Amino acid sequence: TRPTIRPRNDVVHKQLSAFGQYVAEILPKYVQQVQVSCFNELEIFIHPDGVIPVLTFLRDHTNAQFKSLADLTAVDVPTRQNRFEIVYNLLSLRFNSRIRVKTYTDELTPIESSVTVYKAANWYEREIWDMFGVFFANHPDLRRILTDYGFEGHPFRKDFPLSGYVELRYDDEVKRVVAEPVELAQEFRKFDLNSPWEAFPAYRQPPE
Amino acid sequence: SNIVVSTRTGEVMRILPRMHEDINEEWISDKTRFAYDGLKRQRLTQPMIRNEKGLLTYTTWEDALSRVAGMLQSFQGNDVAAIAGGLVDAEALVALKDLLNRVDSDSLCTEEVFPTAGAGTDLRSNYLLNTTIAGVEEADVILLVGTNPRFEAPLFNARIRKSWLHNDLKVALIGSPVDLTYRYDHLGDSPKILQDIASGNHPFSQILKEAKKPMVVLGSSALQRSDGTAILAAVSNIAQNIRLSSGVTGDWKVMNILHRIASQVAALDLGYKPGVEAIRKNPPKVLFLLGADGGCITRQDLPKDCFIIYQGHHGDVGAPMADVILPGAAYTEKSATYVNTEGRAQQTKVAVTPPGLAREDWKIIRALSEIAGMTLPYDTLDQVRSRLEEVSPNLVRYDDVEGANYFQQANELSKLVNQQLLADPLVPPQLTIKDFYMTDSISRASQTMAKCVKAVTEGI
Amino acid sequence: QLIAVDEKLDITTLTGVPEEHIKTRKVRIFVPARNNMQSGVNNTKKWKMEFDTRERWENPLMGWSSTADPLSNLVLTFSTKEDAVAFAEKNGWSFDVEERKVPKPKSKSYGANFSWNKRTRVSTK
Amino acid sequence: LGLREIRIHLCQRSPGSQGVRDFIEKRYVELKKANPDLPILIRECSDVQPKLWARYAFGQEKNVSLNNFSADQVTRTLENVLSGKA
Amino acid sequence: GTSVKPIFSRDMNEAKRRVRELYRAWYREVPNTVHLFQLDISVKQGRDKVREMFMKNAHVTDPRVVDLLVIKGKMELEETINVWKQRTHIMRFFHETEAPRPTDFLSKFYVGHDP
Amino acid sequence: LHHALIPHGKGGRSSVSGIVATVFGATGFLGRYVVNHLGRMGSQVIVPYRCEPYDTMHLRPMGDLGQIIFMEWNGKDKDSIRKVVEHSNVVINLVGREWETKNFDFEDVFVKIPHAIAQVSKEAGVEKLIHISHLNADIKSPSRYLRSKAVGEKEVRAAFPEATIIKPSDIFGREDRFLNYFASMRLGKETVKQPVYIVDVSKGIINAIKDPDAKGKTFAFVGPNRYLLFDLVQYIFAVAYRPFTTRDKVERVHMSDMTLPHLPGLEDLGIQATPLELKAIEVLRRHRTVKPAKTVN
Amino acid sequence: GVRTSPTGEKVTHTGQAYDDGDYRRVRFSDRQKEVNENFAIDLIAEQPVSEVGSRVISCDGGGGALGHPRVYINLDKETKTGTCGYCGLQFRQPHH
Ligand SMILES: NC(=O)C1=CN([C@@H]2O[C@H](COP(=O)(O)OP(=O)(O)OC[C@H]3O[C@@H](n4cnc5c(N)ncnc54)[C@H](OP(=O)(O)O)[C@@H]3O)[C@@H](O)[C@H]2O)C=CC1
Ligand SMILES: [Zn+2]
């Protein structure tokens, strides 16, 4: 390991593994998997029905007390049956640690809103509904937060076009800003950058 | 052969091969790779009609369509006819078939001639490469009559060469002694040799008798000559002797026919009459040239003040002799169906869009039908392909090559008429490499093929 | 607690796509062919969904390439064919599927080069 | 009123096409003996009922199913179509 | 099987009830909006547009899809009540500035390559 | 047909319509709408302007990049007209003035300038020329305005045989001088008026450019209804919630609108004329702080 | 070496010039057309051919790291002169 390689920490790796096993033991009803990254990041995969309990536990337990919600986001993977992946990032100031909770959903199944647990989630959840179309149940006010009023479609889905469907201009006939089907003077050049000759043998998949 | 068209900002950049283990292995011929230069020259972009001076001038789509529809409505019967070129798709073929049927015409012809005597194009196995390209690798002897596969089907000849090198295939030829990149046994040039093979006097009959899996291939070049039906009868007799004497090995399918143009098999499957003899016997007064650039029919052998319609993409020998010109799309510009010499149907994809006012061929014919009042049922591409499935359901299966064997029926239907063989050697048009670079309108329009011809004729 | 409804999934009304870009477009589901310029095969592992080519024209100013459809650069990646077909049906797109092409195994042998009586005898090396 | 062509769509491996298959293998040639100028197209289906299409003058077409028909049955059907009786 | 988690309704009757509620709310809002944003349309034209926007989704047979559509519709209704939207947004429903795209085969054949 | 003149795209802002239009008098009431309709479909517009560029500043957003080119010209000069119409395949004449000026009287505005434009367009190889003149334009008119209009019609017909003449009557628009003129007055019962919407005239001009057989025809663009002047002014004052230019304009507005049933109208161009009541609120909403007028047919 | 078009326009180093019937010329009227006067092809045509007595020469474009990537040019073909792929300079062995 030369100065060009990021050094490994083993103490934190073991600590995170032990705490992940601890959380798994306490909550066997919801926890489906626990992983620790090679760079000491602990992530927990749970059933969607356990968002309110597990988070509450992590917020309220004496050993955990993850009091801060750093971020709440969603990841779109169209090849999965449950399209959307809801990610909760939590920070514990008492133990100076970070955790990640991961959940799955689809276009029609809603997710319970964690506003009752973390207030910070409120706006975050709105953003998810705006950008991926994931519905959050029992939300104080769920509406668009980023897109234009009356915007049709959820732009952060992997099948939404990059340039959208409509574009805005001004019309002097009607004396107002109008929306028309999008037409680009220069179409976006699509570059095929993926190369053959795979780079990382550590991530090779079986040839089924 | 499968290809990949590489484009960039709506312009064809290059052509690359595509791996198909059963058709083109991994490669393509030089013409396929380097003839895309011809898609940018001598292009038809707008409709044209004759002006008062008798010259061709540009016009709108409505004017040209109305001018064609007036003559279509005025005439009827055998006075209306069409010829299909060598670069036409199944969609336009069935479209024009239906259009001329609605006016009660059956003069649907192709430039290449296939003998209609006996079974004709009624049995699919009567005009296909039944052994298939991937099946060439299982043969132990092979006989080639009246063909030069090196320039007539380069990938077929490459497969024969591979089987010759690896499977110790034995190759024999009847025709001119051309070079095939591998050594073969030259029986002769006269068609009479074929008869000897049927009689058993010629020792190659005995050599082929012991073959476990014999293959016989007859090229369309030998069928283009006036004695083609007699040649096909002789080759069918040879195959009959093979099956009855040496025994039926099973589903081997010895009889094979190798074609030269991509539009022939689909037209034969769609009921088109091969050859232009129907046009010659009953000259029409309005004629459709669906990309017809073979030069077979001139204005000399048509009635005076005949009406000629050319619909294609390139300006070639067939365009200036027309009265109304409709610009069509090329194979790089439309999703179109082509059936290869094996009988396998494959569809192209849209790489770029047709230039100027050019449209899709079947769309042009459908619009013409709507203007003339004989409106056709189909409106979209899927409806055209449903019509294709109605006429011939195997034109919508895009990777199947298998088919039933009807050799016995066509064989005993071929034994009725006995035309004598001519005393002319079987000389194919593709004698030398210089004759291979320019064969169709796309090739003749390219500087690359002109450079190839100039380099072949004289080299530094 | 459970509807137990029996109907095919269809989220067409919720995606915000214009009506013309649904019943007219034709997606293609395929494994991309290997680039014959290279011998690597790492780009032929996944399935791709791509839309049909529409009209591109030249800009009167600067001569750039202008387009009008939004789905020109949209290519989706899927693990298996069934996943891609399910996605296409759920989104209400007509699709064409052609099966994966795998290179058949071949009997390679160096000693076949130096053959006593067969034709695999190489002229040089 | 004038017959222009007929097309027989039969399947290769389906048992419901078997009789139709037999018809060809036994009498198709003889039918061509009676009809030297009528194009008798035979084509291949796949999981589709065998069918007979008659295309008359001016593009008028009429189809009849041949599923599970016997060889004598299809012989009679083709005779009926060729003779013009209905 | 095919058992799924509900959103608001369990079967089609409750979804239809919610659709009727939303339609009543939009119908009552139309003239107030027409007056408030100082529109150029009439109230009959606005209610016809509301009817058309409802009839566009008349082919849905999934209670989950229907009630999610209803959730969305209440969202735009709430946008319109509170005048979050400008005058331009309300019009975006009428496509007044767009050229009429013909549908017959001959017109599409003449205008361009678009199928 | 000069391939670069072939339509391309989907008829949007960045598309190509194959129309290269020179719109004389494009800084006016009708010019802005004509340029807007020409630019929203992707056509290239040459705007020849006499005034300062500041007054042409509003035309720029109407087209995409490079689709509108502004050029100086003089009506008295032929070289400027020549160089403005050198490369156009469509020329539209919208030059008009409703009053007298010490440099331009009615004869130069309505006779000499259109004659020069038509002659230069013919000598330059322009395919289509469109000319606009009043509906009530007759030689025997009392007013010099409409007499000059009629002389200009005859002269442009002589110079450009394939010229299309349009005879709109009393166009009313947001920036017009018909509804605003009456609303700024803050005599009739025998005079009849037949006003036509601005957008209808714009679409008529566009279709006439597109229409292939509208070469030498003469059109009369009129509205759906004929209005007595008194009740029309009453309705104008009622819509604005209001209680109820030297010599030529009052004479013109006292004249009745002619009826020319033999000439084709907007219906020939596939346009449904918009009634005045629908757009009266749009025009007159800005003159503030229901019972439409009765019509005669 | 800047040529003039038959219409009167200037032809760029790429050979670009609007023909008689092209409408786009209107963009240049009352304005100017931007053409670079210095043609790289003519300027590189007049360079002298360097004489070196080695079978293989090296070219980096001059300036060291301020030029182009270093390349090696073979001079065995006495028929022609070896040309740098980047710089366009020419090299040739002292025949006779
Ligand atoms: N109610 C109406 O307005 C209808 C109009 N008429 C006809 O329709 C045409 C256009 O109408 P409209 O747009 O309302 O008129 P405008 O008053 O709005 O302006 C007409 C255009 O012509 C130009 N122009 C006027 N006089 C001269 C001149 N002496 N020299 C050069 N350019 C000049 C003006 O440019 P600049 O800014 O430099 O002055 C102006 O851009 C006119 O020919 C008119 O006669 C048809 C029926 C009635
Ligand atoms: Zn150099």
Full DSSP string of G32-86: -----S--HHHHHHTSPPEE-SSSEEEE--SSGGGS---EEEE---TTS-EE-TT
C-beta atoms surrounding D13 within 10 Å: 10
Nearest to F145 by CA among F133, F131, F159: F133
Any idea which ligand is nearest the CA of G72? 2
DSSP SS3 for B99? helix
Query: How far apart are the C-alpha atoms of B368 and B69, rounded to whole Å?
Result: 7
Token output for B44:
């038809």
Question: Integer distance in angstroms from the first to the last C-alpha of chain C?
Answer: 74
Side-chain-side CA neighbours of B274 within 13 Å: the count stands at 24
Query: How far apart are the C-alpha atoms of E71 and E7, rounded to whole Å?
Result: 10
- Dihedral (CA of B144, B150, B156, B160) sign: positive
In chain B, the largest separation of any two C-alpha atoms, in whole Å, equals 71
* DSSP state for residue F63 in the 8-state scheme: S
Query: How far apart are the C-alpha atoms of B326 and B365, rounded to whole Å?
Result: 10
DSSP SS3 for F74? coil
Alpha helices in F12-167 (DSSP H): 29-40, 53-56, 78-84, 106-107, 113-123, 144-159
Query: How far apart are the C-alpha atoms of A80 and A84, rounded to whole Å?
Result: 8
Encoded amino acid at G77, one letter: K
Checking B136-139 for CB contacts under 8 A at 24+ apart, the result is: B136/B160, B136/B163, B136/B215, B137/B162, B137/B163, B137/B166, B137/B167, B138/B167, B138/B213, B139/B163, B139/B167, B139/B169, B139/B213, B139/B214, B139/B215
Encoded amino acid at F285, one letter: R
Helix or strand holding residue B441 (H, E): helix B441-444
Ligand 1 pocket residue status of F132, Cβ below 6 Å: yes
Ligand 1 pocket residue status of F170, Cβ below 6 Å: yes
* DSSP state for residue C62 in the 8-state scheme: T
Encoded amino acid at A112, one letter: E
Write the CA distances from F116 to F70, F162, F266, integer angstroms.
Answer: 20, 16, 28
Query: How far apart are the C-alpha atoms of B271 and F107, rounded to whole Å?
Result: 73
Give strand pairing partners of A6. Answer: none
- Dihedral (CA of F105, F106, F112, F113) sign: positive
Alpha helices in B13-124 (DSSP H): 30-34, 61-74, 90-102
Token output for C123:
């002229």
Helix or strand holding residue E22 (H, E): helix E12-36
Token output for A137:
């149940």
What domain count does chain D have? 1
Query: How far apart are the C-alpha atoms of B228 and B220, rounded to whole Å?
Result: 9
User: Cβ-count burial of B133 within 10 angstroms (0-12 exposed, 13-18 middle, 19+ buried)?
Assistant: buried
Q: How far is B169 from chain E (nearest CA, A)?
A: 51
Query: How many angstroms from the chain centroid is the CA of residue G25?
Result: 28
Please indicate if any CB of chain B lies within 8 Å of the CB of F3. Answer: yes
Nearest to E98 by CA among B269, B351, A182: A182
Token output for B57:
């001038």
By the 8 A CB rule, do C35 and B16 touch? yes
Alpha helices in B136-227 (DSSP H): 149-152, 154-166, 192-199, 203-209, 220-224
Orientation angle between helical segments F144-159 and F113-123, nearest 10 degrees: 10
CA–centroid distance, residue F274 to ligand 1 (Å): 23
Query: How far apart are the C-alpha atoms of D82 and D77, rounded to whole Å?
Result: 9
Partner residue opposite A185 with nearest CB, options F33, F64, F202: F64
Give strand pairing partners of B314. Answer: B43
Nearest to A26 by CA among A61, A76, A77, A1: A61
Nearest to B339 by CA among B400, B385, B271: B400
Query: How far apart are the C-alpha atoms of F279 and E96, rounded to whole Å?
Result: 14
DSSP SS3 for A85? strand
Best residue in C20, C66, C69, C72 for a mutation probing chain F (most F CBs within 10 Å): C66
Query: How many angstroms from the chain centroid is the CA of residue B46?
Result: 27
Query: How far apart are the C-alpha atoms of B198 and B242, rounded to whole Å?
Result: 9
Ligand 1 nearest atom to the CA of residue F169, by list position: 47
C-beta atoms surrounding F66 within 10 Å: 14
C-beta atoms surrounding B286 within 10 Å: 21
Nearest to B308 by CA among B280, B327, B289, B293: B289
Query: How far apart are the C-alpha atoms of B333 and B1, rounded to whole Å?
Result: 17
Orientation angle between helical segments B381-391 and B90-102, nearest 10 degrees: 70
Token output for A150:
């009356």
| Contacting residues of C for E1, CB less than 8 Å apart | 4
Nearest to B35 by CA among B346, B437, B316: B437
In D1-86 the beta strands, taken as DSSP E runs, fall at 3-11, 40-45, 51-56, 61-65
C-beta atoms surrounding F11 within 10 Å: 21
User: Cβ-count burial of B169 within 10 angstroms (0-12 exposed, 13-18 middle, 19+ buried)?
Assistant: buried
By the 8 A CB rule, do G88 and G62 touch? no
By the 8 A CB rule, do B91 and B361 touch? yes
Query: How far apart are the C-alpha atoms of G61 and G69, rounded to whole Å?
Result: 8
Token output for G72:
């090696």
* DSSP state for residue B111 in the 8-state scheme: S
Give the domain range for residue D52: 1-86
By the 8 A CB rule, do F227 and F295 touch? yes
Query: How far apart are the C-alpha atoms of E103 and F16, rounded to whole Å?
Result: 21
Nearest to C38 by CA among B166, A204, B4: B4
Token output for A83:
């399209």
Give the domain range for residue G79: 40-92
Query: How far apart are the C-alpha atoms of D54 and D6, rounded to whole Å?
Result: 4
By the 8 A CB rule, do F41 and F17 touch? yes
Chains touching F, CB cut-off 8 Å, 3+ pairs: A, B, C, E, G
Query: How far apart are the C-alpha atoms of C44 and C33, rounded to whole Å?
Result: 6
The verdict on a CB contact (< 8 Å) between C68 and F10 is yes
Q: For F37, which residue in chain A has the nearest alpha carbon?
A: A173
Query: How far apart are the C-alpha atoms of B317 and B319, rounded to whole Å?
Result: 6
Write the CA distances from F17 to E114, F210, F251, integer angstroms.
Answer: 15, 10, 42
Nearest to B20 by CA among B262, B346, B403, B396: B346
C-beta atoms surrounding B151 within 10 Å: 23
Query: How far apart are the C-alpha atoms of A3 and A15, rounded to whole Å?
Result: 26
User: Cβ-count burial of B180 within 10 angstroms (0-12 exposed, 13-18 middle, 19+ buried)?
Assistant: middle
Q: What is the DSSP string of E29-90?
A: HHHHHHHHTT-SS-HHHHHHHHHHHHHTTTT---HHHHHHHHHHHHHHHHHHHTT-S-HHHH
Q: Please, which experimental method was used?
A: cryo-EM
Token output for B164:
């010759």
In chain E, the largest separation of any two C-alpha atoms, in whole Å, equals 53
Nearest to B127 by CA among B292, B340, B282: B340
Best residue in E49, E77, E84, E97 for a mutation probing chain A (most A CBs within 10 Å): E97
In chain G, the largest separation of any two C-alpha atoms, in whole Å, equals 59
Ligand 1 pocket residue status of F178, Cβ below 6 Å: yes
Write the CA distances from C120 to C108, C116, G23, G75, integer angstroms.
Answer: 11, 9, 65, 40
Question: Integer distance in angstroms from the first to the last C-alpha of chain A?
Answer: 35
User: Cβ-count burial of B138 within 10 angstroms (0-12 exposed, 13-18 middle, 19+ buried)?
Assistant: middle
Checking E105-111 for CB contacts under 8 A at 24+ apart, the result is: E105/B366, E105/B367, E105/B370, E105/B379, E106/B367, E106/B370, E106/B371, E109/B61, E109/B359, E109/B363, E109/B367, E110/B61, E110/B62, E111/F7, E111/F11
Residue with tokens 């289906």: D45
Angle, alpha carbons B277-B279-B281 (nearest 5°): 70
Helix or strand holding residue B243 (H, E): helix B228-246
User: Cβ-count burial of F9 within 10 angstroms (0-12 exposed, 13-18 middle, 19+ buried)?
Assistant: buried
State phi, psi for B14 to the nearest 5 degrees: -165, 170
Residues 350-409 of B with CB under 8 A from C: 350-353, 382, 398-399
> CA dihedral defined by F247, F249, F253, F254, rounded to 10 degrees?
10
Partner residue opposite B403 with nearest CB, options D32, D41, D44: D44
Chains touching E, CB cut-off 8 Å, 3+ pairs: A, B, C, F
Ligand 1 pocket residue status of F30, Cβ below 6 Å: yes
The verdict on a CB contact (< 8 Å) between C13 and E65 is yes
Write the CA distances from B139 to B162, B214, E89, integer angstroms.
Answer: 12, 6, 73
Residue with tokens 């139709």: D20
Query: How far apart are the C-alpha atoms of C63 and F103, rounded to whole Å?
Result: 44
Nearest to B401 by CA among B347, B338, B342, B346: B342
Write the CA distances from B7 to B62, B351, B402, C53, D54, integer angstroms.
Answer: 32, 7, 34, 11, 45
Supply the Cα-derived Rg of chain B in whole angstroms: 22
Query: How far apart are the C-alpha atoms of B188 and B192, rounded to whole Å?
Result: 9
CA–centroid distance, residue G47 to ligand 2 (Å): 12
State phi, psi for G56 to the nearest 5 degrees: -125, 130
Query: How far apart are the C-alpha atoms of F117 and F120, rounded to whole Å?
Result: 5
Side-chain-side CA neighbours of C49 within 13 Å: the count stands at 26
* DSSP state for residue F111 in the 8-state scheme: I
Q: For F11, which residue in chain C has the nearest alpha carbon?
A: C68
By the 8 A CB rule, do E83 and E32 touch? no
Token output for D81:
């179509």
Which domain CATH number covers G46?
A: 2.60.260.40
Query: How far apart are the C-alpha atoms of F201 and A200, rounded to whole Å?
Result: 68
User: What b/e readout covers A79-103, taking b as 16+ CB neighbours within 10 angstroms?
Assistant: beeebbbbebbbebeeeebbbbbbb
Best residue in B1, B3, B4 for a mutation probing chain C (most C CBs within 10 Å): B4
Q: For A166, which residue in chain F has the nearest alpha carbon?
A: F12
Partner residue opposite C59 with nearest CB, options A153, A185, A188: A185
Phi-psi region of A179 (alpha: psi -120 to 50; beta: other; left: phi over 0): beta
If one residue of F50, F51, F100, F249 were mutated to test the ligand 1 pocket, choosing by the most ligand atoms within 8 A of its CB, it would be: F50
Q: For F41, which residue in chain E has the nearest alpha carbon?
A: E99
Alpha helices in chain F (DSSP H): 29-40, 53-56, 78-84, 106-107, 113-123, 144-159, 179-183, 198-210, 229-239, 248-254, 276-284
Token output for F234:
């009453």
User: Cβ-count burial of F193 within 10 angstroms (0-12 exposed, 13-18 middle, 19+ buried)?
Assistant: buried
Token output for B244:
């009855």
Query: How far apart are the C-alpha atoms of F156 and F24, rounded to whole Å?
Result: 15
Supply the Cα-derived Rg of chain D in whole angstroms: 12
Secondary structure (H, E, C), C8-46? CCCCHHHCCCCCHHHHCCEEEEECCCCCCCCCCCCCCCC
By the 8 A CB rule, do E40 and F174 touch? no
**Which residues does F243 contact at the CB level (< 8 Å), separation at least 6?**
F237
Query: How far apart are the C-alpha atoms of D23 and D43, rounded to whole Å?
Result: 14
- Dihedral (CA of A52, A54, A55, A57) sign: positive
Supply the Cα-derived Rg of chain G in whole angstroms: 20
Query: How far apart are the C-alpha atoms of E46 and A63, rounded to whole Å?
Result: 60
Domains and CATH numbers, chain C: 19-113 (3.30.160.190)
Helix or strand holding residue A73 (H, E): strand A68-76
- Dihedral (CA of B166, B168, B173, B178) sign: positive
Nearest to A191 by CA among B4, C34, B9, B19: B9
Token output for C84:
């891609």
Query: How far apart are the C-alpha atoms of E84 and B287, rounded to whole Å?
Result: 66
If one residue of F24, F74, F95, F245 were mutated to test the ligand 1 pocket, choosing by the most ligand atoms within 8 A of its CB, it would be: F95
* DSSP state for residue F16 in the 8-state scheme: B
